[PDB]
Every structure is written in structure tokens, then in C-alpha cells.
Design a binder for this molecule. Structure first.
Ligand SMILES: CSC[C@H]1O[C@@H](n2cnc3c(N)ncnc32)[C@H](O)[C@@H]1O
Ligand SMILES: CSC[C@H]1O[C@@H](n2cnc3c(N)ncnc32)[C@H](O)[C@@H]1O
Lengths: 625, 310, 625, 310
């Protein structure tokens, strides 16, 4: 349900305070590790020689408490970007001191403010702390949605607040964050503590933060309304944002004094729990996609590789998809055998890549449903899966099904097919080489034969996600090109991201392929109009396929087939993030390239700036033929 | 030691304020060690302070004391680390100090308090960026102003005008307030945008002149009338924490810095006196009502120093 | 003098043609490897099955001729970015074919046009050829200063030429180049063949190309004027550009027919030779800097490391610098010993880092010149150099000079110094740790003592050079961070570059250093106004020092000391090039950072975009204490 | 074989032009192998061609022949790979072909030549992007125009107006020229900017109508009067290399493509005839003066084909 902490800038006794906040139901406490007013001098006598202790003892809590219940806070006097040199130097020394203490204590996290535009020296000092011992602990940069200068009451007679709307200006707080994290070179240890105010800004301002590494949301007691019974509550717009933030599973932090003093402070927390339990629940997909959010996976290559038993089991675990296949064959059978010829006719149906036989069973259910007669071939190159097939056929199918242990491109079939059925499609449709496989099989399809599927189309969309950019970047391996991570696709349940433009079709294939000369190579140019300021990090891929006539399957969000939880989209990274201004077009170029040995994708962004061509000659990523 | 008086005064001396009769009000915080709290002390013999046993009255506050002010002769208004402004009242016998009220209205540390000329109202400033106006008798907030865009460093009520007070913030603003204006605040200061303003003191007789100290140790004299920056001196090697006018007809001005020094300046901002007595931060100054040439400083070195000014 | 080739698009006999151009004095020939009109079909019958040969035989020249005398050319029908798919495919196949033939032949270079804005697919195909066998051979991208669309005669009644000046537009040809080379990921094999027209554009347009890898300049016979004797010649503005291009040592290519038909084609070449021999000659520096142009070197660390004999020899090879030192000491001696006290007085002069004794000898020449008396200490931690010193002192100096084999920070001196003299300065002044060394020595300087030098200041300037960006990038090493190359300074005779802004002071040191508390750490923010469109690749560093009063040394170009050829500037790279638009400010931030063990620089660009902080905590680069 | 006539005709047949009397002019290039040159051939018996021994006259050119045109009945104007336009003259006995002039004025391959209606002037187009106008009798360039911004594909003189000619370029421009205008060129064509224009032919009788072929195999009929794109047909699977009108009162139009096919179209652009005879690129077409139903094609397959059109 909800993980939540209490923010305090006053801790008389660490013992009683921690106990109090536990009693109130808080999972953890954000507090200073040095007294916020206890300014320290490091250079000038005599204050430099101030007798210690400089703070309270580690001995006052268990190591386990320090490790789990305490988030430290930078003292508010610490100003590393001060224009006053002596303040800058004392702040550099104090910041290192407080960070070193948090690391001494084994704190899981530490809060640092981004409360102005220039945090260069603060970033330089934090980067130094990070590059001093490899440690796990998080740095939560406390940034507001709305800068305090843009929140101030219009009560200065000779300094009126600007009522002129400034699109870019209202987004200034995101740029504070972006510049800081860029200077600190996207450290995985540096995340956002997003501070929410009584006045939410424009949606565009909230959307800015979509793909950012938000670990915490800070709710001041101030922003809370009062119900008729005087309980704290939130505006519907505030509530909508909480629902958005619950999907990102952030920790909520309550800051400020009890302004609902008719009642206890658990009242604020009780409200959040109330919103959590009363969120619209997640669909089957969302229960399927449970631990997979932003988890990068290698795309399966069921041609080059032999899939494991449990891989086929997951393919089979989505019955709806096979009901679709059953329906396509059912329809195709009725279109091909008139009711007058039902008992004379018997169509040769060939499953090309039969795995453990779900399409074989769907083909059989389809024939009994159509009340029409079929002979079956089950073709499968994975001899491990042929074992499953041959046990099924001996025990159940009988001689109606001829299991063929062969590559469909090599197989010399005893007779031509009326219908070939296949599930040779990846998350980017042709990325398992369905085109090359079915091309090699089509010589044994009758001149009027049907391929199910008859067609498939890949779709791309530009996406922003600093989170996934960092996940990819983290996939550097020894003994290879240090940037190969970025020149390969990943299957991933894209979660913490922003889709910058509607998906556009990329590559399309049709079966049978009538072309007298056939080329499965492709070159596509796409233009994505972008209506927001953002950073491009990569391209989401999806697919649609026409099984038969109106019966389709899709993972494209606008046309998504129901129940097809089986099946996350693909991600094409780029090496360098690209800034996109509102109103600009992202131009991406994709190639499908081939040898006798290998098929691969190459891609480049040509607008609003050029990237390098990614994966030239399959140097980082190929698909085996 | 008196009844209700702590055995031990916290090391970090925050405030020193002489009453009209010459009795000394002391505020102290515990800014390190296990327990981070504060204390209020009354020394009818100022020369005994800081020694706890020789005190007229003393009490323990839940949290540290960021700022203090006398409310008339028996009242003590406190800026707490807790976000509370608390009213403490002297005894009839003045043998103990009792909490009149403690209100948690500020979302962060209360940094600064000032009593307005009426004596029935006060202004609080906080790290939460808000400035609040207090009805002391009904113990409530009349107004709460988010004028500033960073932590409020100082609030100083006008000597004689109950609607007028200065504020300064790390947003680099000095604000002149009049609660009678529908837009109560007005941005004032030097020609040049300069170093952050840290300390404020109205001229006692001249109701439209004040002085401010900066984070770079510069002290400046300002005429609202000119809205021009008259006079500035580089008095300190560090931040000017406080500015206190003498009770003299032509007042002397006490300057206290994190440079651990005290300076006393003429009205032309020239330097008469300098004391290196403190070996830590100098937090407050109060001129004796009885002998106007006597000036008491307190510091985080726990020293109560009595200066004779030439 | 001049390396020059002949460009031809007509070669009836390769034998006679090559012989002809040799007779005319050309070093090489640019020609097609397939007949420019011989369009080839790869997909459609029957033209696909056209009987061969597809071109003329390798047997028609020696391997040596192919290797040295022949630059191949892409056939002009080859249009890989054609909007016509069949033309795109045949062009992809033909381009690979012609490139593969050039590689078959061992051609040293191959010409490809950039004659329009979209060369995406052309870049994709070239990148593929490059990623197919590691080969050395160059690709010369033929780009014009002025696009042909902007050169066309204003002779279309209903399509008038725009006489409205467009700053960015007139630079469109550089962007063609930039986008191509970005897509091909700065391959070192890809360089510019810059084609010059009769009408030169604005200087700004020429300046665009300053730091670019120009290998060849193409002069059409068209652009040549005619002298009274009817010889071909060039405008002064054309001539100025040739002088500019000679400094970059490009190969000049003559294209087009003889338009001075009263005379032979060697007349064009004879003109170039005439300009070469009649260029203003290079100063001593330029003769010094001869083979060092854009050669990246490790900065010397004479503290952490013991310099070799020949390193000291090069330091000594510039007498002017020591005459300056002699002059500073001479002056300081006269300021300190009144003529009345000349024979009573005798000043203790200590050379701190005496190397092989040039400052010792300068100090001695100075004392005889001033007719004043000095006792000398020669302090040197390099025991190899102490050998040179102790032979000098035994054989020549005698007991006037006490050689001390010690670190000046450790040495317990028998008496205090009137004058300390040192040459502890690198190309970025404090980069050899003169500050820390002289700080450690100052306790043995008299209260009124003089340090020569008394002051030094480092200067930075933003620079563009795609050439040096590629040199740095090429310095990846195994067993270290794959981007450490970019997080360290290089000493280099910067040659093929553009300085984007006037140098600004960075860090300054003074000796003696009176500060009661001393900090040699620094944080500096610099703002460089930029008046051109460009790409930032790094920062040039220089220094100035005041030896004494008006006597200085400088490598800063505006104040450069005469004869100080001894001494190239420094380069601070950045990992990612940064686009700068005319009128934008480059903001760079530099830190000088320290331990007890190490001193280092960290740096970041904060405008017009943020970089990563470079060299955080000296992870890539440190200077030993 | 005749005196001065080569033993062997180069494989790549570039041009076929019937004279008024029915004699056949042949241009050929060597586009592969050791020697990259060309040849000019006269066949008074057209059916003997391409066989060299049965030729009326033949000569060797220094370089390949990109384009050709009859100049009256004894003159041959040549577009050379060398950047030269050369004038070749037939013998009195017409037994040999002799160079009248060879001028190297073009900086790259001369791609295209046309004789203007006067017969004393011609227009050249080149890959160097320039279009030149030639005084044939004084053998000089009158004008040189850089109108285009890419290689010039075709130049075609008006039938009856000595100042008027079309040009087309890979800059996607069709230019209508009149040397009597101070700005001589005018940009003409379809509503839609479309596929690069490759081939041009004026209507023989209608002095303000022409047709153009594109790189996508579309043939288009254009009225300067409408400046509108009247009619277009998809005639070829590849580039339209050439367009030739029949001598008929209502002319037929011969269409030749890199698709190695010939098509013959009515004036409505509908297709009457189609020949797959060639097994390489179809380079030219000339209708017989003698039998207007006879049409000779040449190809890079070295085939001289004689078609009978329905
Ligand atoms: C059910 S997932 C797709 C199935 O097709 C099989 N497959 C993929 N390519 C071929 C091929 N060319 N010939 C036969 N089976 C194939 C795989 O082994 C897998 O079981
Ligand atoms: C002549 S180049 C500078 C000289 O100073 C010497 N040097 C550098 N640092 C020190 C030091 N701390 N003590 C003594 N010699 C030094 C070097 O070995 C070098 O010969």
C-alpha cells in the first residue's frame, strides 16, 4: 500500500522523536545529522577551534535503525554556490563533513536541496563524495514543481508578480534538476525528491517529470484542505497527481506542522492510505507486468536459439491469443470449403514453428468448429520441442498430425499447403525473422494458399526516460565495445517514461510474398511532431498483425489486443540524449539490413540534431539466420 | 539555584536583552550533544551570569531558541526550532518563568521575532519563508505573508509605528512593511543589488532611517526618504549577525559578526571600539539602561562579557 | 612546396592519361574506377545479366601506381538518397561495388560528393564499407564552400535569386558536412575535399571550416583570372585562401578543361608553385613547431618525475627566456644593494629547481652585470641533474655555488634568502605545482625577500577542432576508463583549430604568499561571448608570469614573449562536442583541487548547455605532490 | 569495311538518327574494358547495321559519345565525355567522316546536344551544370548559362523558333528558354513538384506543347499555354531515357526506358505497341523518313532493331 516518512527540522531527542513518528505510523524519519543552526567555521581562528562534539553520537540508535529508518538532511546554511568566497569554502567543507557522517552512519538516503538555478559547485562536491568509496546510498535532490519565487504572494507594491504565462519559465525547476544530474553524469545514486505546493502548475510542467527518477514526493501539511468533519484532504487535482505517483511507487514524505490541530498527524497519513486503497485497481496485464517494470531483457531469437520448456509455457499461458488464431483458421476454412464439399474436401494445414503444439490444438479446435476436414503438418526445428510434439501426437493427435523435425526453409514437403499458420513474430514483428522463414516455406504453399498471419507491421514512437537511459548505460560489459549496450534492442515493460509522439508504422511484411525479386531489407524515415520540451532517450517498438481479414493481434497501445499481457514492447536506445523543444520534429531513420548469415537493424536521428548511426554492419547486435 | 531553574545552562548563548530596570534576559540553545533544546534565564545581578546558581529565574524550553524579545517587563516572546512562537511570562515574585502560550504555526524553524510599537502584536520570520503577525492577547495569527522566496533572516518592528516593520531574506530582498497598505510590502535598498542582507536595526529617533548588515561584513545606513544607500563601512571579515543602537541621544551602534568580534560605531559608521573577547560567534548585544556606557555581549563560547565603551 | 593532383571525368586510356598528367607535373590523378555513364542494374532482368567486364583491369597499372597515384571517384549516377526506391537500391549496390573495387586496388583515397542536404543513406553505406575490414584508405567528401543552388546565374525570370543575406543559410554546406561526419561517427578515414568557386562567400562562411579535417582543396580552372600575358592567375582574396590552405598543408586538385588554351595546363600548377614559394616565410617558432602540429603530448610532471637529460637540454635551447631571467635578477639586485653598499652587501640567491644550472649561470651573469655580490644555493631534487650541477660547480662555479640535493619543501637551509628564483611553471602556469613547492620554501625567504617569479596567471579560450576532438578520442587505452582520454590535459602545438573567444584569466598565484591561512585550491567561472556558429571541442590554456616588475614571459598569443618557441599551449578536451550559435555565451567552470597526495583540475561547461564534470576527484588525471 | 572505318564498333549503342534520304547515323561508346572511347557510323543500308564491314562510313572519336545530332544532311554534332562539343562533316563521296571542329568548353562530360531551328546554332548541356549556345559556323560559344543547380540531363531546341529550347536537370527543374529575354529561362511544369525529369520532346506541329519523361517511368504532356500538367501515363518500370515523335500528321510517340522496353503511344498517351526486343538499356529511336511505320531502336546490347508499328 503506502511507504511514507516524516520530515522534521527539529529533533530535541532522537530517541523520543523516532518513537513518536513510529507510533504515528511513519516508515522512516528525515532529519538533520547536525543541528541546522549550528554553523561551523573551518578556516578562521578562533571559531575554527570550537570544542566538540560537532554533533550527537552514532551510539544513540542501532546500526539497523540508521540503515533503515533515517534519511539525513543537508544543513540549510550550507551554500556551496554562494557568491561569498568564505561562505563557499565553509559550505564545501561542511557538506563533505555531513555527507561523510551519513556514510559513517550507513544512512540509506540523504536529502539535498535544489532551491535555485546555479548548483554547479554543489554538484562538484556531491560528485566528489560519490567518487570516494563505492557506496549504495541514495541522494534525494529536493526540487519543487514550482520555484518559491513563482509561488510568492503578490503583496509587494513595487514588485508585482508576472501574470504573463511563460511556457519555458514555468518549467525552470526541471532544468535545475536536468543541469545538476548532467553535471553529476547521471549517477544512479542521484534521484528526485519532488516537492508539491498548494498551487499545482500547468500539466505541461507536471509532464516534464514523467521519465525522471522520482524516489520521493514531499506533501506539505499546508496543501491539505479540511473536510466538514475537519479531517485533512486534497483537491481532486492533487489526488490525480498522488494516483500518478503511486504508479511510480514513490515514498511520500509529510513536511510541516499539524495544521489540523483538532486531530493527530496520522490523519495526513490515514488520508494517503485511503487514496491508496481507493485507487482504480490494475488490469490482468498490470498484475502480469508486476516485477518487470523497466526491467531490460534480451529479445528472444527462437530461430538461432532453441527456446526452453518454460519459455514455451509462458507463450501458451495467454489463451485469448490462440482463440484469435482458432477464429482466423475457422474463418479461412469456411471461405475455402463450401458446405457442399465439407466431406470431399480435407485442407492441408501446416503449422510452421509449432513449438509445443498450441497452434496444432487451435487448428484442431477450428476444424471441429467449422465442421470441415484438415490434414496437419507440425514443423519445428527445436528437437527439445519435437519431443513434446511427438508425445502429444502418439498419445492424442494420432496420424491426423505429421510432426516434422526440420527447418521450414530446408524441408522437402510431401505435398503443397492450403494454409500455413505461424507465431514467428517478436515485439517488433519481423525481429525473429518471420519474413526469411516464411519466404523459404512459400514454395510448398499452393498457388491460392493462405498464410496466417497474412501481414504484420512494426510501429515506433520516440520516448523520454532518463531512468531507462541509465539502465541501458549500466549494461556495459568487459571484452566488448563500451557502448554496445546502446546499439541493441531490449524487450521491456516500459514504465517510468514519456511517449513524445503517436506511434508510426515502420516496416510491413506480407505473406505470401508475390514479388518476383524479393528484398526483406528496409529503409524507413519517420517524422514525429513533438508538442513539449523534453529529452529523447530512445524509441519504443510495437507491432500489429493481421492473422486473417478482421482478426488481428496488437501490442500497439491505441489498438492493443485484449489479454495480450504476454508481450512487452521493445526499446531502441541512443548513445547521447537529445534535447527537443516544443514544436520541433524528431526525425528517426531505421534500416533492416541482411547477409546470408545475419539480419540486423541500424538507426539514426537526423532531427532536430544528428546522432551517430547505431549498430552499423551489426557490429553490436545481429539476429542469426 | 531557583525552584524550576535547570542545574546547567546550554552552551550556545543566543540572546541577551536588558529590561528597563537593568535585569538581564538570557536565551540559550543546545546546538550539539544528545539533547538539542534551549533555556530562558533571568539575572537581576547581570555580573553573576552565566552561572546558573546565581540566577533570579530559569526554565527549560522543549527546543532551541533561535530568537528572543522582552514583551514589556514580564513577557518573553520566543522563536523556537520547533516552528512554534511561544509566550513566556515572569512570576509575580519573578522567581520562575511560566509558558503563557506555544503555537506551532510555522512549517520550519522560527528564525526571528520582533514586538510591534503597540506591545499587543509581534512579527515572526521563519526558514519556511513566511512572515506572520500575532495577536499576543488572543494568541493567534492575524496575517501570514509569503512575500519572500527564501528563508527570512530578520524581522524588526518600527520603534513608534505599530503597522510598520522591516524584513530581510536570502532572496536578497529587504522588505519595508505597512499592514495598512493592501499590498503591505515594499522592496527597498541600495542602488546596487549586493551581498545578502543578514541584520536590521531602525534608528531609535529617526522613524524613516534603518541600518542593515550583509553576509560580507558590510554595515549600511539607509534613508527610506532617499531610498538611496547613504553610507556603508566594511566593519567585519564575516557575516554581520546583529546591529544594536545605544540608548544615547545621538546613539552609538554595536556591530556583532561570526568573525567573533564586536565593533561600536558612531552615527557616521566610523569605529570607536573593538573587542576580540569572544572566541566563538557573537550572538547578541544589550546596552545597560542604568549605565548607557556599559554593553553586554553573549557568544557560543558561553561567555557573558560586559564592555565599557569610550 | 605543393602536392597537387588532376581531376578528370574522362579517361580513354588509363596508361596515356596518367603519363600525360605526370608530364604536366601532377603528383596524382582523380578519376572514375567505372565509366561515369555506365549505369548498372542489380535487380531487374535482363539488364542485370549484362555481360562483363564491369570495368577495366587492375593489370593496367602497377600495384604501386594504384597505391600512390590514383584517387578513385564515385560514379555521378549513384544516388543512395534518391526518393525513387529502385534508384536507391541500385545506388546502394553500385556504391558498395565501386568502394570494394577501390579497396581491391589499394587506392590511397576515394572521392564522394556531398552535393545536397540529405546524405543519410550515403553515410549508412559508407559506414558499412568502413566497418568491413580495418583499412587505412581515406574518403574525401567533395563539398563546395557555396552550394550550386546559391551560385546559379540570376537568369530565371519567375525564379529570382534571393539577394536577402541569410547568415545560417550561407553556412548550409558546412552543416551537410557536419551531419554526414556525425552519422559516420567521426571516422578518421573521412575528411573534406573543399571545392572553391569563382565567388567566395562571406569570411564567416570560410571560418566555418577552420578546425575541420581538410585534406584537399579543389580549384576549378573557371575561377582563374588571366594576366596581361594571358597566364592563369587568382584574385587576391582567392590567393589569401590558398595561403590559409597551405598552412593546413592540403593537397590542391585542379578540375575542369584548359580555359587558358593559349598555353599548357601546367600553367595552373605553375601558378600554385609561384604562390607557395612567394608565401610569407615561417618565424623561428614555426620552424621549431615543425612536426608538432596537433601532436598530443603528456604534460611533464618534473615534481613527481625526474626529467631526462634531453628534456633539460630543450628547456635550455631558448636563450631569450634566460636573458629575461638575467634581467629580472639584475634589476632586483640594483633595487636591493645601493652602489654605496656594493662591496659590503652580498645577497643570498637560491635557485629552487636548478635543473642543469641555466638559472645558476643567469644569476651569475646578472651579479657581474649589476656589479653586485651574491652567494648562490642550487636546490634540485632530481639526483641525475645534481650530477650535472656538481660537475659544473667543481669545474667552474667553485664555492660561490652550494649545490643542494633536496626537495625545497623538506630542505633545512643554513640561512634565509634575499631572492628565490625558479622555473617550476608549465603551459598552464601552476600545472607543475609551483604554488605548493614555493609555499614549502618560503619559510627560508627573508621577511623582505623577493620570489622571481613574483606572479603567474593561467588563461583559457574555447576552441573548435573536430581534428583534435578525433585525436583525443583515438587515445582510448585498455585497462582504464574508456573516456579517460577526455578527462586529462594535453600539451599540443594547436594548429588545425578555431579559437572561439579571447583568452580570459583563470587562476593566479603570488610569491611570497602572505595569506595567514593559504589555500591553493581554486574555483573560477568564465563567460566567453561567441560571435559565430561553431562546435566547442575543448579549451586552449596559456600562461603569463611576472619574473620582476615589467619583465615577463607569456605564451598567451596577444602578449606572447618573443623567441619562446620552447613551449606549446595546453588543451582541456570535453567528451561531447557542444553546438554554439552566434551570439551565445560559452560558460566554463574550472576547479584546482588537492589532497596531501595529489593536485588536479576538474572542469564543466554550464552554457549554452551543461557537460558532465570532467576528471572528478582526479579519477582520470592527477599531478603528484 | 570502308577506308578510315574501324574494324570493330564499340558495344554500347548511344544514338540512332535517320537522315531525310533514309541513311542511318550511329553513335557508340566503349563504356567498359581497357579503352573508353566512341565511334560515328553511316549505314546507307540500315538493315546491315550494326555490322561494320557493310557500312557507308565510320570514324573513331577520342572519347565516348553521350549524345548526337544530324546538322542538316552532312553534319554530325557530338556530346563527348571529354567536355568537348565536336562537329564532324560527311565526305563529298560520303565514304569517310572528318572532324570539322572539337571545342573543350565544358568542365565535365557533355551530356546532351540539340540543333536550333536556324541550323547555324546548337545548345549543349553538361554534368558541369552549364548550358551553352554555339555559333556552328564561327565554331564558338555565344552564351553560357548556369541556370540549373545540378547536372543537365536534356536540351531540346524548338522545332520552328531559333531562340527557344527546353532543358531539364536533376535540380528537378524544367526550363523553357528564349534567348530574346534578358532573363532567358523560365521554370515550367506540373502543379506537383514530382520525380526528376529525364527526357524531353516538343510536339512537331504544336509549337507550345512538349512531353517529358521522369526517373519513375511516367510520361507527361505539357501545354506552356495552360502551364498545366494535361496528361500523364505510367509507361515504364524505370527511367524514361528518350521520347521521339513519328513523322505522321497526327504523330505517334516512341518511349524508351532503362526497363529495356520500347512503347509507342497515341497523342492521348495510350499504348499501341510494346517491344521487349532489347536485353539491355534502350538508348535511341528514329522513325524511317521512307516508311513512317518503321522505327529503329539501339541498345547497350549492341542490337539495331527495326520495328513495324500498328
Ligand atoms: C512457438 S515460437 C516460434 C517457433 O518456431 C520455431 N522456428 C523458428 N524458426 C524456424 C524455422 N525456420 N523452421 C522451423 N521452426 C522454426 C522455433 O523453434 C519456435 O518453437
Ligand atoms: C628546470 S625545470 C624545474 C626543476 O625543478 C625541480 N623541482 C621540481 N619540484 C621540486 C622541489 N619541490 N624541490 C626541488 N626541486 C624541484 C625539477 O626536478 C626540475 O629540475
Amino acid at each position: 500500500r503506502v511507504s511514507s516518512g516524516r520530515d522534521l527540522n527539529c529533533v530535541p531527542e532522537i530517541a523520543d522523536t523516532l518513537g513518536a513518528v513510529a507510533k504515528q505510523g511513519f516508515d522512516f524519519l528525515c532529519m538533520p545529522v547536525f543541528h541546522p543552526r549550528f554553523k561551523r567555521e573551518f578556516i578562521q581562528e578562533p571559531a575554527k577551534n570550537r570544542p566538540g562534539p560537532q554533533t550527537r553520537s552514532d551510539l544513540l540508535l542501532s546500526g539497523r535503525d540508521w540503515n533503515t529508518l533515517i534519511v539525513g538532511k543537508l544543513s540549510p546554511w550550507i551554500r556551496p554556490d554562494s557568491k561569498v568566497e568564505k561562505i563557499r569554502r565553509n559550505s564545501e567543507a561542511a557538506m563533505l563533513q555531513e555527507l561523510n557522517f551519513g556514510a559513517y552512519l550507513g544512512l540509506p538516503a540523504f536529502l539535498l536541496p535544489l532551491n535555485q538555478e546555479d548548483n554547479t559547485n554543489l554538484a562538484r562536491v556531491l560528485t566528489n563524495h560519490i567518487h570516494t568509496g563505492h557506496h549504495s546510498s541514495m541522494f534525494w535532490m529536493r526540487v519543487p514543481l514550482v520555484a518559491p519565487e513563482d509561488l510568492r504572494d503578490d503583496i509587494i507594491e513595487n514588485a508585482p508578480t508576472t501574470h504573463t504565462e511563460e511556457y519555458s519559465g514555468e518549467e525552470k525547476t526541471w532544468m535545475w534538476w536536468h543541469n545538476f544530474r548532467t553535471l553529476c553524469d547521471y549517477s544512479k545514486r542521484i534521484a528526485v525528491a519532488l516537492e508539491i505546493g498548494a498551487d499545482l502548475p500547468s500539466n505541461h510542467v507536471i509532464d516534464r517529470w514523467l521519465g525522471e527518477p522520482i524516489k520521493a514526493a514531499i506533501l506539505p501539511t499546508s496543501i491539505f484542505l479540511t473536510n466538514k468533519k475537519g479531517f485533512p484532504v486534497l483537491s481532486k487535482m492533487h489526488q490525480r497527481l498522488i494516483f500518478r505517483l503511486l504508479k511510480l511507487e514513490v515514498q511520500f514524505i509529510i513536511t510541516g506542522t499539524n495544521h489540523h490541530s483538532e486531530k493527530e498527524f496520522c490523519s495526513y497519513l490515514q488520508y494517503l492510505e485511503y487514496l491508496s486503497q481507493n485507487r482504480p485497481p490494475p488490469n490482468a496485464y498490470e498484475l502480469f507486468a508486476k516485477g518487470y517494470e523497466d526491467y531490460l531483457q534480451s529479445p528472444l531469437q527462437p530461430l538461432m536459439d532453441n527456446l526452453e520448456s518454460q519459455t514455451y509455457e509462458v507463450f501458451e499461458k495467454d489463451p485469448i491469443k490462440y482463440s484469435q488464431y482458432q477464429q482466423a483458421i475457422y474463418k479461412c476454412l469456411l471461405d475455402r470449403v463450401p458446405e457442399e464439399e465439407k466431406d470431399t474436401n480435407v485442407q492441408v494445414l501446416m503449422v510452421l514453428g509449432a513449438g509445443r503444439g498450441p497452434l496444432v490444438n487451435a487448428s484442431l479446435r477450428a476444424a471441429k468448429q467449422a465442421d470441415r476436414r484438415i490434414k496437419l503438418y507440425a514443423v519445428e526445428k527445436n528437437p527439445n520441442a519435437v519431443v513434446t510434439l511427438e508425445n502429444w501426437q502418439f498419445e492424442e493427435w494420432g496420424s491426423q498430425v505429421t510432426v516434422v523435425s526440420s527447418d521450414m526453409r530446408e524441408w522437402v514437403a510431401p505435398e503443397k499447403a492450403d494454409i500455413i499458420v505461424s507465431e514467428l513474430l517478436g515485439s517488433f514483428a519481423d525481429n525473429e525473422l518471420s519474413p526469411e522463414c516464411l519466404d523459404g516455406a512459400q514454395h510448398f504453399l499452393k498457388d491460392d494458399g493462405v498464410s496466417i498471419p497474412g501481414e504484420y507491421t512494426s510501429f515506433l514512437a520516440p520516448i523520454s526516460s532518463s531512468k531507462l537511459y541509465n539502465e541501458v548505460r549500466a549494461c556495459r560489459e568487459k571484452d566488448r565495445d563500451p557502448e554496445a549496450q546502446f546499439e541493441m534492442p531490449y524487450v521491456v515493460r516500459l514504465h517510468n517514461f514519456h511517449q513524445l509522439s503517436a506511434p508510426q508504422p515502420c516496416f510491413t511484411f506480407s505473406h505470401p510474398n508475390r514479388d518476383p525479386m524479393i528484398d526483406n531489407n528496409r529503409y524507413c524515415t519517420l517524422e514525429f511532431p513533438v508538442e513539449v520540451n523534453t529529452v529523447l532517450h530512445g524509441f519504443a517498438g510495437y507491432f500489429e498483425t493481421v492473422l486473417y481479414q478482421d482478426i488481428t493481434l496488437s501490442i500497439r497501445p491505441e489498438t492493443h489486443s485484449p489479454g495480450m499481457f504476454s508481450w512487452f514492447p521493445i526499446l531502441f536506445p541512443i548513445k547521447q540524449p537529445i534535447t527537443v523543444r516544443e514544436g520541433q520534429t524528431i526525425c528517426v531513420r531505421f534500416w533492416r539490413c541482411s547477409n546470408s548469415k545475419k539480419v540486423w537493424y541500424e538507426w539514426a536521428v537526423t532531427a532536430p540534431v544528428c546522432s551517430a548511426i547505431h549498430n552499423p554492419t551489426g557490429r553490436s547486435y545481429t539476429i542469426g539466420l | 539555584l531557583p525552584p524550576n531553574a535547570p542545574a546547567c545552562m546550554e552552551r550556545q548563548l543566543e540572546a541577551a536583552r536588558y529590561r528597563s530596570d537593568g535585569a538581564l534576559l538570557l536565551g540559550a540553545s543546545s546546538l550539539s550533544g544528545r539533547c538539542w533544546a534551549g533555556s530562558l534565564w533571568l539575572f537581576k545581578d547581570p555580573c553573576a551570569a552565566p552561572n546558573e546558581g546565581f540566577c533570579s529565574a530559569g526554565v527549560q524550553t522543549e527546543a532551541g531558541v533561535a530568537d528572543l524579545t522582552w514583551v514589556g517587563e514580564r513577557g518573553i516572546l520566543v522563536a523556537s526550532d520547533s516552528g512554534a512562537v511561544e509566550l513566556w511570562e515572569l512570576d509575580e515574585n519573578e522567581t520562575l518563568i511560566v509558558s503563557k502560550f506555544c503555537k506551532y504555526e510555522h512549517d520550519d524553524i522560527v528564525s526571528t521575532v520582533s514586538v510591534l510599537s503597540s506591545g499587543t502584536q509581534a512579527v515572526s520570520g521563519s526558514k519556511d519563508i513566511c512572515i506572520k503577525v500575532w495577536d499576543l492577547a488572543q494568541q493567534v495569527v492575524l496575517s501570514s505573508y509569503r512575500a519572500h522566496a527564501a528563508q527570512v533572516t530578520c524581522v524588526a518592528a518600527s520603534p513608534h509605528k505599530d503597522s510598520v516593520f522591516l524584513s530581510c531574506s536570502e532572496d536578497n530582498r529587504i522588505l519595508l512593511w505597512d499592514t495598512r497598505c493592501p499590498k503591505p510590502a515594499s522592496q527597498i535598498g541600495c542602488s546596487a543589488p549586493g551581498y545578502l542582507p543578514t541584520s536590521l536595526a531602525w534608528h531609535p529617533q529617526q522613524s524613516e532611517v534603518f541600518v542593515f548588515g550583509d553576509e560580507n561584513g558590510t554595515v549600511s545606513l539607509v534613508d527610506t526618504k532617499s531610498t538611496s544607500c547613504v553610507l556603508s563601512s566594511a566593519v567585519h571579515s564575516q557575516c554581520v549577525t546583529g546591529l544594536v543602537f545605544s540608548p544615547h541621544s545621538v546613539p552609538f551602534l554595536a556591530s556583532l559578526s561570526e568573525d567573533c568580534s564586536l565593533a561600536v560605531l558612531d552615527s557616521s559608521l566610523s569605529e570607536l571600539f573593538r573587542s576580540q573577547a569572544h572566541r566563538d560567534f557573537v550572538r547578541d548585544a544589550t546596552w545597560s539602561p542604568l549605565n548607557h556606557s556599559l554593553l553586554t555581549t553573549v557568544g557560543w563560547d558561553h561567555q557573558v562579557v560586559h564592555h565599557v565603551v569610550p
